[PDB]
């Protein structure tokens, strides 16, 4: 299989990031990161490919008062890709998914990180382009 390597995190709790799908939401306010144990005073942060719990702050009204599982697909923080390549995107973006991993939406706007596509095949299936 293959386990995702460590990358620069860059997106702590409280970061609001773009919505990259056709769900109707416009942004995702990260409230926590899945699989984070913790440390005193340390904010839980997430790179690309990480499942997060997010609440949409603006968008279609029947999504705003809920917590959704979400996956970060693009980030503005540079991260090393174990081949010497430092990659960063133009914006931080994520998609709305469920626990199993398939997206609530049906299409994705813009590229998706290679790590996120590898770790979530259902997101990669809807991916317009791979970065």
């Amino acid at each position: 299989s293959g386990a995702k390597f460590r990358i620069s995190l860059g997106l702590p709790v409280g970061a609001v990031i773009n919505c990259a799908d056709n769900t109707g939401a416009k942004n995702l306010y990260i409230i926590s990161v899945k699989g984070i144990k913790g440390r005193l005073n340390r904010l839980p942060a997430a790179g690309v490919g990480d499942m997060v719990m997010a609440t949409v702050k603006k968008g279609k009204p029947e999504l705003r008062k809920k917590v959704h599982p979400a996956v970060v697909i693009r980030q503005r923080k540079s991260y090393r890709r174990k081949d010497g390549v430092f990659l960063y995107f133009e914006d931080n973006a994520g998609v709305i998914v469920n626990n199993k991993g398939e997206m609530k939406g049906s299409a994705i706007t813009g590229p998706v990180a290679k790590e996120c596509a590898d770790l979530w095949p259902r997101i990669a299936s809807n991916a317009g382009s791979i970065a």
């Binding site: 199993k100 095949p121 259902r122």
Partner: protein, 441 residues
């Protein structure tokens, strides 16, 4: 040229039905190499690598996620002798009605039996399905079948002779009770995932010489499963009888409309001919006739054809109806029909009032006993007793039945495939019934 048949593959869960069927399709010119390369690419993407050949028929997303067979699928592959379309049974007791529907539209049955340790014994149990599939195929009217043996590369040691001899003996010693002759039923050891003994004679298992069959109509002996698929005797097609179409599924294709797909039983279906449906009783006119991405000016019996009728919605006509010619005598709503249920395995007593699920041809509606007329012994319709209070396992009986949900049925004297039906209760098999009388409205 060529003639048309239908084949169902039946067996135990996790034995690799869809995998072996799909790799048989691939060997017989099913689809090009790069599309199935993309299929294996997907299979490696999410994880189910060994489930790659299953995707050729298990196209549903729920099947593609759980790795569990759900729906009956069709795929066309041309063989050495004649055309054949294959039925892929689910193999689950939650989907037993789906298997019954699929096996109904099949002329031959393929009884794939696992040879690996554990799976074979788990198949042969009260919790098993190998008994269930064969018994209900014998109930629904499939005469000639084949028993296939799979997973010679999973057993220890692989490609064993004693293992296969035990398999054949243990299949025979109960399929004689079921009703299929091992002298006519061929026995093949195969392995779909490895791809041996299917298209070319095997080299990893030289101990297998070749199966032999001894039928009255024809004697055959081959080495590959194609050589056994092709030697299947051509069924007698009763084309003079009035047209009947036990419907499989309904589809709403954009641009052509709601096109039913159902097996032709009797008669000939043609473009430009008004047809009727028994359960929905709405008249409609056939526009065209096609099968398996190819067209037909005539539809022959035992064929999976897709014909476009005019001005009926997808919701109006649903799964399991009966269609026929409007000019000839039509199938009509049956208020009651006198059936001959032969009780096989029922713990409790069967009095008038208990409601099992009765499955005439395709669909599935629970029906209720009205009263039990006479007790009949196990063969020939020999009279024993009048009006028993209750029925018990090991006895045949003639019964008058009153279904609750509306349905149409036909007798075993006019359309023999329509006369075959089963009775199911307590999540097992409880009776074998045939229709010999029927009342219309």
């Amino acid at each position: 040229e060529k003639t048309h048949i239908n084949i169902v593959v039946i067996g135990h869960v996790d034995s690799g039905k869809s995998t072996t069927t799909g790799h048989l399709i691939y060997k017989c010119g099913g689809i090009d190499k790069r599309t199935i390369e993309k299929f294996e690419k997907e299979a490696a993407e999410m994880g189910k690598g060994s489930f790659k050949y299953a995707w050729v028929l298990d196209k549903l997303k729920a099947e593609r996620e759980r790795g569990i067979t759900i729906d009956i699928s069709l795929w066309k592959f041309e063989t050495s002798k004649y055309y054949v379309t294959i039925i892929d049974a689910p193999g689950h007791r939650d989907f037993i009605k789906n298997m019954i529907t699929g096996t109904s539209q099949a002329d031959c049955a393929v009884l794939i039996v696992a040879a690996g340790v554990g799976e074979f014994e788990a198949g042969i149990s009260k919790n098993g399905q190998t008994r269930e599939h064969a018994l209900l195929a014998y109930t629904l009217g499939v005469k000639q079948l084949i028993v296939g043996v799979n997973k010679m590369d999973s057993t220890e040691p692989p490609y064993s002779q004693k293992r296969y001899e035990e398999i054949v003996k243990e299949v025979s010693t109960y399929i004689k009770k079921i009703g299929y002759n091992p002298d006519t039923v061929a026995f093949v050891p195969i392995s779909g995932w490895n791809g041996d003994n299917m298209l070319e004679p095997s080299a990893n298992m030289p101990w297998f010489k070749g199966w032999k069959v001894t039928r009255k109509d024809g004697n055959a002996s081959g080495t590959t499963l194609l050589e056994a698929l092709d030697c299947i005797l051509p069924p007698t097609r009763p084309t003079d009888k009035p047209l009947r179409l036990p419907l499989q599924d309904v589809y709403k294709i954009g641009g052509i409309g709601t096109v039913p797909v159902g097996r032709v039983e009797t008669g000939v279906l043609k473009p430009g001919m008004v047809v009727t449906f028994a359960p929905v009783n709405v008249t409609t006119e056939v526009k065209s006739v096609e099968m398996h991405h190819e067209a037909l000016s005539e539809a022959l019996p035992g064929d999976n054809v897709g014909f476009n009728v005019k001005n009926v919605s997808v919701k109006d006509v649903r799964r399991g109806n009966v269609a026929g010619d409007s000019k000839n005598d039509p199938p009509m709503e049956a208020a009651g029909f006198t059936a001959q249920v032969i009780i096989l395995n029922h713990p409790g007593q069967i009095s008038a009032g208990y409601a099992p699920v009765l499955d005439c041809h395709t669909a599935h509606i629970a029906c209720k006993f009205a009263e039990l007329k006479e007790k009949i012994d196990r063969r020939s319709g020999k009279k024993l007793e009048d009006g028993p209070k209750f029925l018990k396992s090991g006895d045949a009986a003639i019964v008058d039945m009153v279904p609750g949900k509306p349905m149409c049925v036909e007798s075993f004297s006019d359309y023999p495939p329509l006369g075959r039906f089963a009775v199911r209760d307590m999540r097992q098999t409880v009776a074998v019934g045939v229709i010999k009388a029927v009342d219309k409205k």
